[PDB]
Amino acid sequence: HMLSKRDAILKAAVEVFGKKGYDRATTDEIAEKAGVAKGLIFHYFKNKEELYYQAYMSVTEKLQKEFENFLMKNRNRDIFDFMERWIEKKLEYSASHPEEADFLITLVSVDEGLRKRILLDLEKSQRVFFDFVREKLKDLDLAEDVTEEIALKFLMWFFSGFEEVYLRTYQGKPELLKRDMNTLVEEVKVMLRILKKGMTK
Amino acid sequence: HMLSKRDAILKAAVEVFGKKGYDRATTDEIAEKAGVAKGLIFHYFKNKEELYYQAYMSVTEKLQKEFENFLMKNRNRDIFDFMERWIEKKLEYSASHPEEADFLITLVSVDEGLRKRILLDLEKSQRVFFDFVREKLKDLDLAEDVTEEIALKFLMWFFSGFEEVYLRTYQGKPELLKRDMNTLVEEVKVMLRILKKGMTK
Missing domain, CATH: 1.10.357.10 (Tetracycline Repressor, domain 2)
Structure with missing residues (x-):
């Protein structure tokens, strides 16, 4: 088994926010790091x-x-x-x-x-x-x-x-x-x- | 007399950086606050x-x-x-x-x-x-x-x-x-x- 999609996204987020900070981090880059369609962050997280x-x-x-x-x-x-x-x-x-x-x-x-x-x-x-x-x-x-x-x-x-x-x-x-x-x-x-x-x- | 253009710009900068922080602040907004052409920040400050x-x-x-x-x-x-x-x-x-x-x-x-x-x-x-x-x-x-x-x-x-x-x-x-x-x-x-x-x- 792998992480659920939501946990894959939280993990990528933790990594990209910690690397770039809140303002510079992009959700596209987090999605690509989590290996999920760009759309899926909206689906789970709204913004x-x-x-x-x-x-x-x-x-x-x-x-x-x-x-x-x-x-x-x-x-x-x-x-x-x-x-x-x-x-x-x-x-x-x-x-x-x-x-x-x-x-x-x-x-x-x-x-x-x-x-x-x-x-x-x-x-x-x-x-x-x-x-x-x-x-x-x-x-x-x-x-x-x-x-x-x-x-x-x-x-x-x-x-x-x-x-x-x-x-x-x-x-x-x-x-x-x-x-x-x-x-x-x-x-x-x-x-x-x-x-x-x-x-x- | 008024402030020199460079001091008008530093003052506006101090205010907009302190209000919005470094990432959210725009140099256009600092220029408008300093009452100077957008161009003038490049002239004095480069970036x-x-x-x-x-x-x-x-x-x-x-x-x-x-x-x-x-x-x-x-x-x-x-x-x-x-x-x-x-x-x-x-x-x-x-x-x-x-x-x-x-x-x-x-x-x-x-x-x-x-x-x-x-x-x-x-x-x-x-x-x-x-x-x-x-x-x-x-x-x-x-x-x-x-x-x-x-x-x-x-x-x-x-x-x-x-x-x-x-x-x-x-x-x-x-x-x-x-x-x-x-x-x-x-x-x-x-x-x-x-x-x-x-x-x-």
Whole structure:
């Protein structure tokens, strides 16, 4: 068996959007990459915005599922330990799935009104990790200048800024990420230890 | 007197690139906004990539100059104090120059080979602040797990991630930045105090 036509199209989309970005990618080129009549993208996806949106939901629901597995198991850990170990796993995923990684980072090139739609539709699923951190922070010996709110904000921006930075620095260059991996991992351990120390009593 | 034709074109460019981004902006629309024959953009700028590159160099040399003024004067300060106070000043600049701000943040939408060119050509001028931080970090009581290198890396990513985040969150919405200013400033003070504490003895 081969992929269904819709999955052949999502795969080509993930590859061409990640290679060219949203504006430069053409649906003809995605159709030719998927080995389907040009017509078939209209049939399944309506327009180029919708193809992009469904491919982002499709890749991100794969991630969300990796995440719930990790959550379900590592729930009882110290949150900083939880984060370092989650970041390592994301690094490893990005290196083993470079096309997906390159595609995820394109969210920034798109018109504000497609990125906004995506962020609305992702909010519920991003909120699972977010709501988990918030709860764990109550088990935290914090410091009389550091609100739980600043602590939550600093940690989330750390966690999602880090991701953005490496996806961009290593875009198209998986072997270099694999070469820098355990240096990156080690830098991350120390940076979370700086936050923990600066944040707590 | 009015602006020179080249400055009328750079101003329109800054506005249309910041409004539409690099790919969607047309040079015809910039010419019409600048009130110049369509031909005149070719005459001064050659192509759309070159217009974009010269407008980024033009806005960024304005910034660099603000920066050297601040540097020249605040050179003797504690680096964390120096940074908080520099970030406040950048916030205030962004609120009073929203079109420039919106334009700077578009650097990410452009083809890798135009952003790369820009980063090469900016490296020398970004390195002034970078080389200053590096030096001040030697006057720092650091902690036996924190290399000057991780400390430099954490601080620079803090400083330039913060910027990216607010330019994006407040894109097109200057009144909201002005409304959130002194809350943002206060969050920043506390986050740099977390870094200082986590980073030092």
